[PDB]
Amino acid sequence: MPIIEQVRAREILDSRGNPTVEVEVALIDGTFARAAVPSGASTGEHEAVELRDGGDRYGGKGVQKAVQAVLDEIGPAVIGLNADDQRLVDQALVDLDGTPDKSRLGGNAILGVSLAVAKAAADSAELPLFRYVGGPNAHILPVPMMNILNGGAHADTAVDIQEFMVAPIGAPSFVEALRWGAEVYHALKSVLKKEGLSTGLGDEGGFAPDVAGTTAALDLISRAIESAGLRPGADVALALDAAATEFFTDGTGYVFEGTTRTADQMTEFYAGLLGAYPLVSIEDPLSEDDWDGWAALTASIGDRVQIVGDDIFVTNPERLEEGIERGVANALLVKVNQIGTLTETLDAVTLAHHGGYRTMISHRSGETEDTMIADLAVAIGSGQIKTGAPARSERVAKYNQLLRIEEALGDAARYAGDLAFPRF
Amino acid sequence: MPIIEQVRAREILDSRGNPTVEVEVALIDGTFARAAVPSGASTGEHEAVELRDGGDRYGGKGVQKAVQAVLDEIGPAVIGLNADDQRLVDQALVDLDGTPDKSRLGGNAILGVSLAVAKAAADSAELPLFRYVGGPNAHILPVPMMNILNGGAHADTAVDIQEFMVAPIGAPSFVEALRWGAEVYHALKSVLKKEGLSTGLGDEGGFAPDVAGTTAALDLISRAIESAGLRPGADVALALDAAATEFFTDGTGYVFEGTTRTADQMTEFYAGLLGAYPLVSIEDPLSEDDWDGWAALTASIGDRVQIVGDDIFVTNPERLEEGIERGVANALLVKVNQIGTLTETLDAVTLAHHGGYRTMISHRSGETEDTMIADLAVAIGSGQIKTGAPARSERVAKYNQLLRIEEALGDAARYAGDLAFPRFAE
Amino acid sequence: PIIEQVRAREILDSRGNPTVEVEVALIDGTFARAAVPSGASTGEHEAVELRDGGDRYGGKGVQKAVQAVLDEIGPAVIGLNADDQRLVDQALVDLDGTPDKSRLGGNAILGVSLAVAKAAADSAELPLFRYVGGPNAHILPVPMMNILNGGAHADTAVDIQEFMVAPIGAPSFVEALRWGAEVYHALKSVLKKEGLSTGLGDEGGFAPDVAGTTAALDLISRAIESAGLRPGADVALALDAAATEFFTDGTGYVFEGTTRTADQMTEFYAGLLGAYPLVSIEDPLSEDDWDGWAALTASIGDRVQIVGDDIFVTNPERLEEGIERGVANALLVKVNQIGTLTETLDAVTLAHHGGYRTMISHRSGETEDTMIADLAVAIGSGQIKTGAPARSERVAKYNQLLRIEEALGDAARYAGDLAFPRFA
Amino acid sequence: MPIIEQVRAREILDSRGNPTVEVEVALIDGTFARAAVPSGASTGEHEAVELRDGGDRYGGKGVQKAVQAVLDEIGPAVIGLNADDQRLVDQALVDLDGTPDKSRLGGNAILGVSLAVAKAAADSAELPLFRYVGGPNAHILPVPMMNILNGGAHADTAVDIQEFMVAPIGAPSFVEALRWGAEVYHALKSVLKKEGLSTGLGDEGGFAPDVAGTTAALDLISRAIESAGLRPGADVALALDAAATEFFTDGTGYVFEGTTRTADQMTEFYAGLLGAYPLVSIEDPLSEDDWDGWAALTASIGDRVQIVGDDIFVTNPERLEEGIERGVANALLVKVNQIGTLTETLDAVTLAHHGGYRTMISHRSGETEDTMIADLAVAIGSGQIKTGAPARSERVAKYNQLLRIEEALGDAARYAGDLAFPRFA
Ligand SMILES: O=C(O)[C@@H](CO)OP(=O)(O)O
Ligand SMILES: O=C(O)[C@@H](CO)OP(=O)(O)O
Ligand SMILES: O=C(O)[C@@H](CO)OP(=O)(O)O
Ligand SMILES: O=C(O)[C@@H](CO)OP(=O)(O)O
Ligand SMILES: [Cl-]
Ligand SMILES: [Mg+2]
Ligand SMILES: [Mg+2]
Ligand SMILES: [Mg+2]
Ligand SMILES: [Mg+2]
Ligand SMILES: [Mg+2]
Ligand SMILES: [Mg+2]
Ligand SMILES: [Mg+2]
Ligand SMILES: [Mg+2]
């Protein structure tokens, strides 16, 4: 009997030492589940609102008010509902908040309850979460897109691109892909040490050295792949997240690598990178609201490379719909906490999948020991996950949980590999 | 512990009184589930093989051999597997058979076990089948595409079009859609009596009068719509299944409505219908291997109407992929028994959806009391189902189950309505 | 086995008209479902079937009947023991408070009555035939199959309502079923050869517009022989004249182009007896033509079973009058003609103890409900009438008899020719 | 009963992306529990043996052999036993391996089963781990000793001391102490950015700037405390882990801040820090085997500050029994994976605890999302835990788990705060 009996939240700390919400949901059958809520640094203007305390505790980053909203309003709204009725529960939370951006109770108070209900429902059914959420057809292990050299908002350097990722598309299985990524990341550490370069980690576990720009970073990573005994392209390809909204000024343009430049100018830069490097994917090449820019870039390089919308779409169906209509991007980055409920997230995934767009399930720069996105990647069959360097366990715990999913699936497991990236 | 412990099969009768397979699967936790297998009349060349006994019993249509395959071979292969591992079970059945068209064990022996395993898994997990299969986001009640006037292979008349369907797209909910369709169906019976035409039912529960051609049939159904107090198009729209393979001869062409016609002439006929009637969907306008014809027809009218691949795709990922690459059809009919496992069926569904194609879960003309397809339609969010006139309970039991699913979902239920048919605009 | 919840809903029957479905849940978690059939050729004296009138569904909605279940019936039975069928049925009959169940509706009452019976059986972990009929329940009935349909059940001018085949010589139910299916498919091919319609009437039988009764019977005899079986010894014939439907009070029986007295109809039937292997004739005469039934029964009732349907309406009061007057020698049993399982069992008892045979019957409007299959075995009738072997509202009953036969194993007995002692 | 029915292991990755062992234990009653094994960088000579595959995969660091050893040998040797009899299980593990340093089957293979069996037993009794191991009297929340400025073996800078730690001894509860340490950690980041120093993290989530001296590091931390609105010493104190073995050369001596130094010159160093800074604890101030330096340093300054043996004792009853006899240090760092069973860990703690020595439960520089040391700190009533900066979740999950334990204890919880460091005043 999976009727919701108690809902409780607490303040815990994320992987940067900042407060976040963790929710536990208890069912009348004795089922108990826990979910934690991630937190971003390069957050788009259109993200669901995260409710912070202000005041002096934790530099203004407390979430006691989010915890109190769970105990005082959310709990009582959902107690007595069937945990299996995810859409009902998510609708109730959306209606109770009553604002479009979840500003009254906080996307952070709402999402923790939304995800803990999904987990309890799965546990009560005695199904692994990937299988509860994706049904019995769920089986595809994602290519891990590993941010091993971290810039922009995620470290304290003057490198413009936020994320330089490796993608072990050539591996035969997820267990092998994970090994290739780890061995490239360890080879990079060694290449950096041998040059003069810093091996201090950024927020997502990648190295934060201070190199001349994009191409210097890509040559360092190409060297790391070969050092690991692997082939650039055939074995391990490359991806970027520019988070270009972060180096866009309205009225001025793209303040990038020395120059102020236009959308078409940024487009020609990326196009140059595609001819010289085995790039499979480029994320947020232009800013969150540069629609005309994105439309021109997509027509120009969209056939040759995946173009992923992050801050332009914010995991938001209305925004993704406009993107699909205006021919903007060909992939959606899927961040549960940019929209605030599991239901809206799955509506965004469906809208993308049916529009011929791919999805890549994503962590935030502020993560926790929660591993739910690993199960989500498998459930939605995205074939792509972005959840950090293979270092710092808020990143590694997700990789370890994909090992467990792959092993439980046994012979039915399939690794997305090359097929995740048909344009390459 | 939803581990499979026993697998039993028996011979039951379908809704034409012919033999078919029913399978029961028991799990160690005590769960027990039963699934039955449907049978087609107008069966594509490329469907998974349906194993029949031959000989004298039941006119050669026995399925004792399929039943014996389940007890001697399939059962022992799957006992000890976890029912939750649907893909592992389905791969094991495929491999055990060892042939591309399931001809050794039969797609009928294989699918019974595939479907019973899925039902057992869902009951063990204590989730309704739509929710087990579709996960917690499943919620969309399909438009019921109701075949209210039956021709071709489903009756003994000279009507070449197999299926003349009504589609209550304008209804606010599934419960109301089902009412509109039943009301048109009862109005049609009345119009047929008035015209002195036969109200004897065909295989799928629709009237089987021997009307002169497509336009006579469409005109009798528009009258039924208006007589039920509904607006053709905006409230209740129309659809066809020509099952054109059944009137196509190789090189000769389409023997249709008293003349021989090419794929292009068939296309001009359909375009003529679209201009004159509120059609939302045409299925199998052309023959199962007329790939050149289908590509031309899709480019010609595919923007104005949905065009559904049935015998051309046979719920087969390999054939669907070709279609998508060659610009053939913009929708897939989904028939679990055309391919023979739940897994391959869901692989064909995902591939259609990701390819911009729509899907429509289908009964066969030989159905049973089994209601799995109602839950499956909700599970995949097709927004479209084809499962009979609202008459004969092997059709109506599915509608009844959709009423039960819509009730279970409470305020989260959504009816696909006219959003299932964007190309249409009364 | 305490009753905890009672819900009803409106579903559709096999002709697409609304009808009642009820669910009963017990304290122990048991949950059972039952549906109500509906006739077309309904006797004047049947329990009242409550319809909504107004526009929905051409007046044939049953929302009022559903509302009666939720408002009044459920509250009255919640807390009773589902095992106490006789106490529950008495409670239902007392709550309505009218002789013909016109206040709440026979459809609202029967649905709760059957659903209580299913729930008690599930609760005891017993198939329904065993729950109701106890350890001695074991007889598989001869399936009396209406393979050519006329009168009320199609749109032709054939006056006789049902033309049935009865596979009396089969060694088992499973073989009886195949025999009736083989003859049915042989009839279809005979009709096509003659250029006659193979469209189905309401009960799955072909509805050709044949010249009259002997034309129909000749076509069925041909079908029996075409299937390799002997008319009589293997597959016999039965009729349901539904004569109430062609009788007009004060004028007589308007039948095959002439107007006839009860006596002339008796002569017609006796003529059929001499020319064809008939084992049973139902409603040869009208529902209140008591004198006519008396004379006919004395005239031909030694040579053939004579079944009262519309004359008795499964009603102890009417049957007791028929017995006293020498009217018929068998009872057709329809749960929905009287409105409770208890009162149905009492009609059976009164018939059985009075040496009258019984034949459990569908209505022309059926559902996917299969209760009558279990009921026929539970009461030992040896005879069931539930359609041609086509249309699953008919066929689901035959499939359920296969399952019952299977579960009985070596205790199963097929009633075969012992159901028809007057024949041969 | 809680009888062991299956034991599985798998290769996972640790917080630096190197393989390590994870084990699952399933009881006949349905219970399934999971434990993971950590791995150090600055590993002592005398630690239990960490079985690595060698070869090509993972730069030689695979643990497929350790995983295989669990399936082939340890699994069958413990199935059938009662998960409640920790001592009998740990004895069967130690005897099976048969070597004193666990080199045949691997300390990593053995520990994983030892801890997964304890987690299973706890889950079967429906008890949190702290309460299962520690019994009803387990209630003390430890002071979090937070390595917020990382050097030595845990980064690539020229900083000699391995760990610069803050200790929120003045907080009224664990929940408050956690926030104090987070706030100092965040204030240090902003200080370092001011000074144009690196805020890139080392292995344990602490900043790894390349600052000049030990005093340069303590001055930056000191400013951080003050900038966080807290009082150095009274609110937040300082601790050190010098990991001296990592800069000791047998023969030539202590190579430290550009000078070879004797045992007694370093002491002179440590006692200078004691006067200028609010220090409550100095760990491994001398080398793993420098038995006389320790005895002298401990006489010299052990009255005034906690002196923690790590590499010198390696959570090993024998090595510690020695340190006590020879007046060496006054605290033991407790690493379950330096000794390889839970029983032997609890034995080494008991030796220390009866003998006057304080204990500090420790992480390894390679951690996982496992949180068992949080519960182990509380079970044994240590009052001190060393488990990283409040950043990187392989650290932070331990702190979050201490929040939940504090919650669950309710009014029974006591924060050890000031009472953990009696010599400080
Ligand atoms: O930009 C992103 O995609 C994310 C994850 O790498 O970072 P943040 O959570 O800071 O937005
Ligand atoms: O053609 C079809 O689509 C089906 C369903 O109506 O008919 P059959 O099962 O006979 O193929
Ligand atoms: O007359 C009968 O015996 C029944 C069933 O065959 O028909 P109706 O349900 O239409 O009364
Ligand atoms: O030296 C230590 O005390 C530990 C923990 O900080 O590091 P390592 O695990 O590398 O030995
Ligand atoms: Cl006819
Ligand atoms: Mg961002
Ligand atoms: Mg981004
Ligand atoms: Mg067909
Ligand atoms: Mg078709
Ligand atoms: Mg009747
Ligand atoms: Mg009758
Ligand atoms: Mg060390
Ligand atoms: Mg140390």
UniProtKB/TrEMBL annotation, chain C:
EC number of this enzyme: 4.2.1.11
Keywords of the record: Cytoplasm, Glycolysis, Lyase, Magnesium, Metal-binding, Secreted
Subcellular locations according to the entry: Cytoplasm; Secreted; Cell surface
Protein family membership: Belongs to the enolase family.
Coiled coil: none
Reaction equations catalysed: (2R)-2-phosphoglycerate = phosphoenolpyruvate + H2O
Chief localisation class: cytoplasm
Annotated positions binding Mg(2+): 240, 282, 309
Domain of life: Bacteria
Annotated Gene Ontology cellular component terms: cell surface; extracellular region; phosphopyruvate hydratase complex
Binding site residues for (2R)-2-phosphoglycerate: 161, 334, 363-364, 385
One GO MF term: magnesium ion binding
Full protein name: Enolase
Pathway where it operates: Carbohydrate degradation; glycolysis; pyruvate from D-glyceraldehyde 3-phosphate: step 4/5
Binding-site list for substrate: 153, 162, 282, 309, 361-364, 385
Ranges where the Enolase N-terminal domain occurs: 3-132
Keyword Metal-binding among UniProt keywords: yes
Functional summary from the UniProt entry: Catalyzes the reversible conversion of 2-phosphoglycerate (2-PG) into phosphoenolpyruvate (PEP). It is essential for the degradation of carbohydrates via glycolysis.
NCBIfam families: eno
Organism lineage string: Bacteria, Bacillati, Actinomycetota, Actinomycetes, Mycobacteriales
Ranges where the Enolase C-terminal TIM barrel domain occurs: 137-422
Cofactor(s) of this protein: Mg(2+)
